[PDB]
Amino acid sequence: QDKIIHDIRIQLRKAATELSRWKLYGSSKWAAEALAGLAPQNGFGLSETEYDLYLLGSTLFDAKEFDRCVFFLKDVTNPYLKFLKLYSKFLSWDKKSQESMENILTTGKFTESQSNISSILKEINTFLESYEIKIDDDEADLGLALLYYLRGVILKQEKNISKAMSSFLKSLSCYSFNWSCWLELMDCLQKVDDALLLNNYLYQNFQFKFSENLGSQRTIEFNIMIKFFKLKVFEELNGQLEDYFEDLEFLLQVFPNFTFLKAYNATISYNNLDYVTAESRFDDIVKQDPYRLNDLETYSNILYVMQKNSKLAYLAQFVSQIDRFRPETCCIIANYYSARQEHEKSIMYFRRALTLDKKTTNAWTLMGHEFVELSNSHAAIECYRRAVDICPRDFKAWFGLGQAYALLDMHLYSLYYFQKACTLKPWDRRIWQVLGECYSKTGNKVEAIKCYKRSIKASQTVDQNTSIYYRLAQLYEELEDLQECKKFMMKCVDVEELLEGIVTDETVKARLWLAIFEIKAGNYQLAYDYAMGVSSGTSQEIEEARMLARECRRHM
Amino acid sequence: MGVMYFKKNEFVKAKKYLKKALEVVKDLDPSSRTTISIQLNLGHTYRKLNENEIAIKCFRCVLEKNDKNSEIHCSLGYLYLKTKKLQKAIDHLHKSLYLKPNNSSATALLKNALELNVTLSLD
Amino acid sequence: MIRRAPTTLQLSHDDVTSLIDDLNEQKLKQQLNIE
Numbered sequence: 001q002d003k004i005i006h007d008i009r010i011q012l013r014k015a016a017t018e019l020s021r022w023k024l025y026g027s028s029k030w031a032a033e034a035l036a037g038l039a040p041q042n043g044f045g046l047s048e049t050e051y052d053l054y055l056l057g058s059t060l061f062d063a064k065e066f067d068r069c070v071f072f073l074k075d076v077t078n079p080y081l082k083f084l085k086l087y088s089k090f091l092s093w094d095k096k097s098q099e100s101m102e103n104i105l106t107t108g109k110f111t112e113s114q115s116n117i118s119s120i121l122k123e124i125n126t127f128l129e130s131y132e133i134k135i136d137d138d139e140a141d142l143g144l145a146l147l148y149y150l151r152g153v154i155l156k157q158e159k160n161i162s163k164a165m166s167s168f169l170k171s172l173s174c175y176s177f178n179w180s181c182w183l184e185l186m187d188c189l190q191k192v193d194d195a196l197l198l199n200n201y202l203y204q205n206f207q208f209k210f211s212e213n214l215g216s217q218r219t220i221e222f223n224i225m226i227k228f229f230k231l232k233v234f235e236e237l238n239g240q241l242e243d244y245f246e247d248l249e250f251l252l253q254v255f256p257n258f259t260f261l262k263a264y265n266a267t268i269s270y271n272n273l274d275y276v277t278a279e280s281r282f283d284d285i286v287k288q289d290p291y292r293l294n295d296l297e298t299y300s301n302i303l304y305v306m307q308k309n310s311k312l313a314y315l316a317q318f319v320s321q322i323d324r325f326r327p328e329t330c331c332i333i334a335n336y337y338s339a340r341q342e343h344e345k346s347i348m349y350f351r352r353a354l355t356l357d358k359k360t361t362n363a364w365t366l367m368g369h370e371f372v373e374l375s376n377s378h379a380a381i382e383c384y385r386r387a388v389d390i391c392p393r394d395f396k397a398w399f400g401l402g403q404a405y406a407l408l409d410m411h412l413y414s415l416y417y418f419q420k421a422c423t424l425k426p427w428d429r430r431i432w433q434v435l436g437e438c439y440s441k442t443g444n445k446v447e448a449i450k451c452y453k454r455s456i457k458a459s460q461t462v463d464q465n466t467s468i469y470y471r472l473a474q475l476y477e478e479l480e481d482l483q484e485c486k487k488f489m490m491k492c493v494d495v496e497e498l499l500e501g502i503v504t505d506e507t508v509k510a511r512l513w514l515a516i517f518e519i520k521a522g523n524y525q526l527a528y529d530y531a532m533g534v535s536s537g538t539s540q541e542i543e544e545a546r547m548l549a550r551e552c553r554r555h556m
Numbered sequence: 557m558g559v560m561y562f563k564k565n566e567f568v569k570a571k572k573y574l575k576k577a578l579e580v581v582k583d584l585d586p587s588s589r590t591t592i593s594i595q596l597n598l599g600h601t602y603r604k605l606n607e608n609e610i611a612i613k614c615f616r617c618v619l620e621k622n623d624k625n626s627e628i629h630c631s632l633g634y635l636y637l638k639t640k641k642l643q644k645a646i647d648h649l650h651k652s653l654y655l656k657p658n659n660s661s662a663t664a665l666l667k668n669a670l671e672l673n674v675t676l677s678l679d
Numbered sequence: 680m681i682r683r684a685p686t687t688l689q690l691s692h693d694d695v696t697s698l699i700d701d702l703n704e705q706k707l708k709q710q711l712n713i714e
Contacts, residue, residue: 385654412674415670415673416670416673442674443674450679562688589685590685593684593687596687600688600689604694627687630690631689631690634690634698661690664695665698668699672706675706
């Protein structure tokens with residue numbers, strides 16, 4: 001620490017004010033909030049005849065009169081005042097850029113297209129090419145980073161992801177300590193192997209502009225929120241972690257009582273499916289910052305699994321009391337109605353929350369689940385599709401499609417959808433088993449076993465493996481490996497001893513088949529032993545086992 | 557003329573004239589149904605000529621130029637199905653049927669990709 | 680004076696069906712080698 005923390009305070013004060021100056025609410029909100037957690041430097045390149053336009057442009061933007069700002073700055077030769085016009089020009093188009101299909105679902109009304117950004121993108125390229133000083137060398141300043149960041153997000157709109165990375169990384173090199181720029185960098189990955197490749201780029205190829213930044217900040221490893229970058233990537237997708245635990249500790253010692261870190265830290269418990277510890281960590285945040293509403297839908301999601309409706313209802317009452325039209329408020333309320341089995345009304349509030357941001361967390365997927373319980377099976381599959389388009393890293397979106405298509409007669413579609421989600425979260429025990437069950441329709445029995453044998457290993461606890469053991473024998477019966485059927489269906493019989501003789505229905509079929517098989521093999525004494533082992537179940541199995549027992553005794 | 561010479565199954569003078577047209581208009585007409593059309597046609601000639609490699613790149617650059625187009629996605633899926641890259645073609649197919657409702661040929665090609673996915677047993 | 684859309688042609692039915700048939704050939708002959 002020592003002067004390192006003091007050096008952060010001064011420079012973080014900069015990122016809080018200049019970013020707020022040029023109408024970037026999201027980035028400045030994080031930076032300003034980081035001042036409170038952490039335990040008037042002014043300057044800009046402007047002339048008196050041009051400084052008025054910035055006041056003119058800023059105050060019209062604040063009054064939310066977006067379009068008139070564009071006209072009043074029709075010509076601006078300032079290096080980075082042009083960004084403010086172009087930013088307003090972009091958002092003016094975006095609010096009316098609603099896809100026709102997606103709009104029917106998000107509203108339910110059931111009733112020039114994109115050429116603007118093509119001109120918007122071309123303008124940025126034209127301005128930069130004709131600009132005096134490029135990104136190279138120790139030139140450039142904060143203002144140029146905004147232009148490149150704006151250029152990057154427009155590029156992501158046309159799904160030019162490959163070039164989008166180059167623009168964003170180029171903006172961050174010029175100016176660091178901009179949080180909103182890195183959020184858009186998250187959505188560019190949509191894969192696991194590139195993250196380490198991108199990590200290699202930062203460690204070797206990437207370099208910072210020390211001219212703008214303060215001391216001990218050009219270096220990548222002494223930088224503080226490069227850890228924030230590493231923290232975010234390894235929670236969205238686990239993969240293989242590099243220094244994840246060590247750098248997390250250092251960031252925890254700094255930034256005391258920082259609510260975002262605690263919410264992130266507790267979200268790890270939810271990702272690890274440790275609900276009991278998740279509530280305790282979440283609850284402390286509520287006491288500290290009652291009026292913070294971000295990432296509160298995760299709190300409702302955790303409470304939904306525990307089904308603590310009494311606790312959940314008060315959370316909805318408390319959340320809705322202070323604010324009634326933020327996306328997390330409506331999402332929590334919509335989650336509440338589901339607990340009351342009113343799946344038909346939860347869509348309404350999920351619908352309302354979506355119209356607020358239209359790029360949220362997994363609120364699209366939760367909308368799809370509520371349709372499934374209504375047996376619509378067609379709104380859900382298309383509702384699930386929209387979540388795929390926005391965030392292709394969402395496990396639940398892909399799984400919902402494969403699960404929904406499983407109910408549908410055509411199971412062949414479900415294989416591909418499960419395969420993609422399989423790569424995203426290979427650690428889940430359910431997805432491997434469900435993939436194998438749907439994959440048996442394919443008729444290629446060999447690959448199912450490689451999937452099936454991975455399901456049992458990933459299933460951890462052995463008692464749930466009794467059900468899938470019977471599936472292994474059934475598939476092996478389709479091949480000339482009836483002996484292999486015996487050994488595995490013997491294994492589930494052994495698990496009965498481990499499970500204190502639960503003698504469930506699954507082992508009832510397991511025991512009777514083995515007596516029948518051993519009878520066919522001439523081992524009457526052995527088959528007689530399992531004959532009395534089926535002492536419970538349906539009447540027919542009791543009668544059949546007694547017939548096997550009666551038969552075995554005659555041949556002894 | 558390039559289309560004309562493509563129609564008579566010559567596939568050499570068509571390519572030459574289309575390439576000449578494209579080098580003439582390298583500087584101007586970045587969009588607006590002229591660069592898109594010529595590059596798409598040249599890629600289609602390359603596809604029929606079985607030179608799929610450069611076809612991949614030209615179809616990709618057209619796709620990144622303009623993205624809402626079912627024909628480009630269907631042709632790229634066909635190009636991938638010509639090789640063995642089914643993992644990177646089923647997504648393009650699905651996007652193509654998302655963009656345009658029927659696409660009967662695209663539906664048949666996607667169905668064939670499904671039977672391939674059933675047959676293959678890759679890890 | 681206005682120019683209409685220039686002539687562009689896409690995948691016909693005959694060539695895609697021929698590729699379907701060839702694709703069936705190659706997913707039909709290899710399992711004979713396996714068996």
